[PDB]
Amino acid sequence: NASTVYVPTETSDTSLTVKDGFQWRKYGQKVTRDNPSPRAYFRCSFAPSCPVKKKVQRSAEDPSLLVATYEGTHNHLGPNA
Ligand SMILES: [Zn+2]
């Protein structure tokens, strides 16, 4: 149920923001010793009607990339228009 994409991101940008046409509510953050960098947890602004969740973290393989993982598919059009 998950799709992962890779977003090259300036290394000085630690905000864990991936712009994707949709709106998000950040609800969680995880910090762990296996990644030097936090993981941010978001739910779609159309929650609970929309089930999509989004997790963003720097790649531990290529730290020039953010890894954005989306769970679910949006059941609505993107509100950033
Ligand atoms: Zn949605």
UniProtKB/Swiss-Prot annotation:
It comes from the Eukaryota. Residues 13-79 bind DNA. Induction: By salicylic acid and pathogens. It is found in: Nucleus. Belongs to the WRKY group II-a family. Transcription factor. Interacts specifically with the W box (5'-(T)TGAC[CT]-3'), a frequently occurring elicitor-responsive cis-acting element. Positively modulates defense-related gene expression and disease resistance. This is WRKY transcription factor 18. The gene is WRKY18. The chain holds residues 160 to 238 of 310 of the full protein.
